[PDB]
Amino acid sequence: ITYDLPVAIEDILEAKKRLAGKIYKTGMPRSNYFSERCKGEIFLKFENMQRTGSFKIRGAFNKLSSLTEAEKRKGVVACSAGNHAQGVSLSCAMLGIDGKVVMPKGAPKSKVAATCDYSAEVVLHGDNFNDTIAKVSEIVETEGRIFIPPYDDPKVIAGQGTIGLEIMEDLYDVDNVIVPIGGGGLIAGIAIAIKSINPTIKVIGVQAENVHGMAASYYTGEITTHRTTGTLADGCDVSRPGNLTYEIVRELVDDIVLVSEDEIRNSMIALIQRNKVITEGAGALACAALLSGKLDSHIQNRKTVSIISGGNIDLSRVSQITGLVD
Amino acid sequence: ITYDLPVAIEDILEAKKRLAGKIYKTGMPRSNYFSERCKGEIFLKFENMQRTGSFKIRGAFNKLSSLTEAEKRKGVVACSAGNHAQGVSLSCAMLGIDGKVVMPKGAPKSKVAATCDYSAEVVLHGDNFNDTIAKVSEIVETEGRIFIPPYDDPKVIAGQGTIGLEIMEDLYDVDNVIVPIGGGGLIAGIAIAIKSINPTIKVIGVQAENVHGMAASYYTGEITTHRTTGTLADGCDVSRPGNLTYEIVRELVDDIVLVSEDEIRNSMIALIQRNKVITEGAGALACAALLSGKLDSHIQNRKTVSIISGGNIDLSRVSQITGLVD
Numbered sequence: 058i059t060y061d062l063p064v065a066i067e068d069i070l071e072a073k074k075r076l077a078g079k080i081y082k083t084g085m086p087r088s089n090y091f092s093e094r095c096k097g098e099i100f101l102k103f104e105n106m107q108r109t110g111s112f113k114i115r116g117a118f119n120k121l122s123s124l125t126e127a128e129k130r131k132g133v134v135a136c137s138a139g140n141h142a143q144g145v146s147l148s149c150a151m152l153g154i155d156g157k158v159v160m161p162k163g164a165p166k167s168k169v170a171a172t173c174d175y176s177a178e179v180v181l182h183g184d185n186f187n188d189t190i191a192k193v194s195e196i197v198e199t200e201g202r203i204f205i206p207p208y209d210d211p212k213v214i215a216g217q218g219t220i221g222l223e224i225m226e227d228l229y230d231v232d233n234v235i236v237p238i239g240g241g242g243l244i245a246g247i248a249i250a251i252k253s254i255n256p257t258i259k260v261i262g263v264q265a266e267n268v269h270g271m272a273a274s275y276y277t278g279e280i281t282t283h284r285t286t287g288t289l290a291d292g293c294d295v296s297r298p299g300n301l302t303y304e305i306v307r308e309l310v311d312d313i314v315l316v317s318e319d320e321i322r323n324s325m326i327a328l329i330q331r332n333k334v335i336t337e338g339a340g341a342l343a344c345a346a347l348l349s350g351k352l353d354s355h356i357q358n359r360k361t362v363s364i365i366s367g368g369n370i371d372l373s374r375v376s377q378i379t380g381l382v383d
Numbered sequence: 384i385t386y387d388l389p390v391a392i393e394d395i396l397e398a399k400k401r402l403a404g405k406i407y408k409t410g411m412p413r414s415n416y417f418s419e420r421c422k423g424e425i426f427l428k429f430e431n432m433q434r435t436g437s438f439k440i441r442g443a444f445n446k447l448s449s450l451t452e453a454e455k456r457k458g459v460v461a462c463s464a465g466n467h468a469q470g471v472s473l474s475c476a477m478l479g480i481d482g483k484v485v486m487p488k489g490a491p492k493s494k495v496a497a498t499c500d501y502s503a504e505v506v507l508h509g510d511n512f513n514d515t516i517a518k519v520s521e522i523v524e525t526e527g528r529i530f531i532p533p534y535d536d537p538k539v540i541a542g543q544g545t546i547g548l549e550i551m552e553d554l555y556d557v558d559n560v561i562v563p564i565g566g567g568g569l570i571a572g573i574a575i576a577i578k579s580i581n582p583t584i585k586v587i588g589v590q591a592e593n594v595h596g597m598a599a600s601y602y603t604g605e606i607t608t609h610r611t612t613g614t615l616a617d618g619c620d621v622s623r624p625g626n627l628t629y630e631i632v633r634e635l636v637d638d639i640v641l642v643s644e645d646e647i648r649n650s651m652i653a654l655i656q657r658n659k660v661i662t663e664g665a666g667a668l669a670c671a672a673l674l675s676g677k678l679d680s681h682i683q684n685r686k687t688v689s690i691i692s693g694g695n696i697d698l699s700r701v702s703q704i705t706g707l708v709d
């Protein structure tokens with residue numbers, strides 16, 4: 058019962074070797090509140106407490122560590138306004154690699170500062186996706202640096218999948234894993250890890266109502282773009298999924314639900330008040346799906362893990378969300 | 384993909400509750416020697432280091448603990464020349480239950496003494512299977528005591544299955560579990576635990592060439608007796624499998640191989656010299672199958688757990704086996 062996929066269980070196992078004693082397993086405690094609400098056992102995987110505040114250090118470290126020395130000498134380049142920038146920057150520091158990160162003008166101040174702190178050279182260029190991405194292109198041509206994709210890359214995908222191995226390690230009798238989706242690298246990685254070892258474990262995706270390239274592609278049967286507008290779950294603001302990640306998702310993901318901006322906010326408020334954890338919109342998507350009622354036939358009297366993918370949210374936004382008549 | 388079986392995953396979960404803080408998980412370390420020989424990862428589950436020296440305390444404790452107080456007041460009775468006697472006796476002590484164990488005249492001295500030590504009343508009766516079993520019958524009629532089957536009982540089976548849950552707990556990515564068979568309670572319990580959670584995990588049985596009721600039944604497609612003669616694996620000297628255990632095995636067990644007396648001896652010698660553990664014939668069956676070469680297409684480049692079911696062997700027999708030109 059195999060699959061001819063661009064990533065495989067062996068790739069994840071290599072990633073585990075490369076990350077050992079460098080990147081560490083995150084806590085995954087039971088949530089009493091979500092368990093009570095959902096009438097089933099609910100566990101929170103704290104990738105918000107992973108280094109840099111999201112899981113993205115995993116994929117970036119794997120891809121950078123897997124490079125040959127000749128390749129590491131070339132230097133690397135990446136492009137992000139967010140968590141990928143931080144992961145690539147920190148990974149560069151840990152491995153002693155020279156790295157540039159192209160961030161768009163208009164990228165959030167906190168995230169520019171953080172990726173600076175992590176040691177990589179930050180290049181603020183472009184008020185436009187084409188202008189920003191064209192700088193990365195210009196950098197590849199003239200400098201020969203190696204591009205590090207945020208999700209559409211076999212090594213990046215395989216690094217995110219280490220999360221799936223940790224889940225079955227901490228909870229052998231898990232039934233469902235609920236995973237947020239932007240480009241699809243996170244869920245692709247996890248699906249491969251989970252389905253390769255125990256295919257009876259359900260892997261279910263979650264995206265914002267406002268923007269869900271992958272959901273649209275998943276339900277249409279081919280890659281389509283979808284974006285009606287922006288979202289609180291800014292980490293998963295992706296109109297078009299990656300090629301490798303779509304192939305894997307169509308093959309291995311059980312379902313993908315959609316949640317509204319209000320449900321995401323409610324999920325963040327609930328995580329703060331009832332579980333004492335800070336979450337960005339993307340990090341709360343899975344928990345929003347659990348409260349939506351849409352996963353009810355999967356989660357009642359079962360054990361379900363919700364992925365808290367990230368906690369990189371400006372304090373001003375924390376202030377606003379907690380300050381609402383709520 | 385369900386099964387209409389006399390035991391189910393919930394029964395094992397109840398057994399886990401009943402055993403918690405009473406019966407404890409056994410170590411399951413890697414064997415370097417067996418891994419080298421088999422060209423795959425091999426792990427030894429040390430049920431020889433379970434209380435009483437075999438796993439049988441698990442099934443007996445579960446069945447006895449599950450009784451109502453009215454039922455516990457009736458007293459219990461069992462029949463064995465070996466490890467079942469010890470498990471029932473110790474379980475009685477732990478639960479404060481009054482128990483009789485009918486052992487055949489001719490039962491090994493060490494095993495009579497041990498079940499005495501464990502507090503139950505020992506009744507030595509019968510030079511004959513019919514004479515011995517008829518005493519248990521006489522005891523049931525006249526005293527109203529509750530009989531405790533060695534394997535053909537849903538609560539007994541479910542207690543042995545706790546071993547399967549421990550395996551996936553200690554090794555989530557296990558591929559094969561190799562289990563000795565007498566009456567079939569051990570393997571039945573494990574199969575249900577393993578297959579209910581992860582059916583991609585292979586469960587494979589092992590019996591002596593000299594006597595293999597279950598193997599014969601498994602390959603014939605109905606219950607048949609088989610016994611050509613006695614065996615070193617005295618714990619698995621059973622001509623006819625139980626009814627409940629056969630139904631489960633036919634349904635859930637991947638294969639059953641047979642090993643010779645020489646292979647069993649070789650396996651015991653190997654466990655002593657290379658892994659420093661004491662094993663009875665039954666406890667070494669699974670390891671004998673691993674060295675036989677018969678499981679080669681399952682174990683190379685995989686992770687396999689061998690069940691060391693028991694260590695209750697007379698020192699005189701240890702002296703003889705280690706004293707051979709070997």
Ligand SMILES: Nc1ccn([C@@H]2O[C@H](COP(=O)(O)O)[C@@H](O)[C@H]2O)c(=O)n1
Pocket residue numbers: 107108109110111143167170171172174368369
């Ligand atoms: N200069 C920095 C560096 C890190 N951080 C944030 O602090 C959190 C913890 O970072 P470390 O894991 O690197 O300690 C992360 O969410 C990260 O984004 C920050 O807000 N400003």
Ligand SMILES: Nc1ccn([C@@H]2O[C@H](COP(=O)(O)O)[C@@H](O)[C@H]2O)c(=O)n1
Pocket residue numbers: 433434435436437469493496497498500694695
């Ligand atoms: N009187 C006794 C009591 C126990 N034993 C054995 O000692 C080993 C350890 O027993 P305990 O787990 O009860 O300490 C077991 O194999 C058991 O059969 C014995 O040989 N003689």
Ligand code: NA
Pocket residue numbers: 225226227228229551552553554555
């Ligand atoms: Na575990």
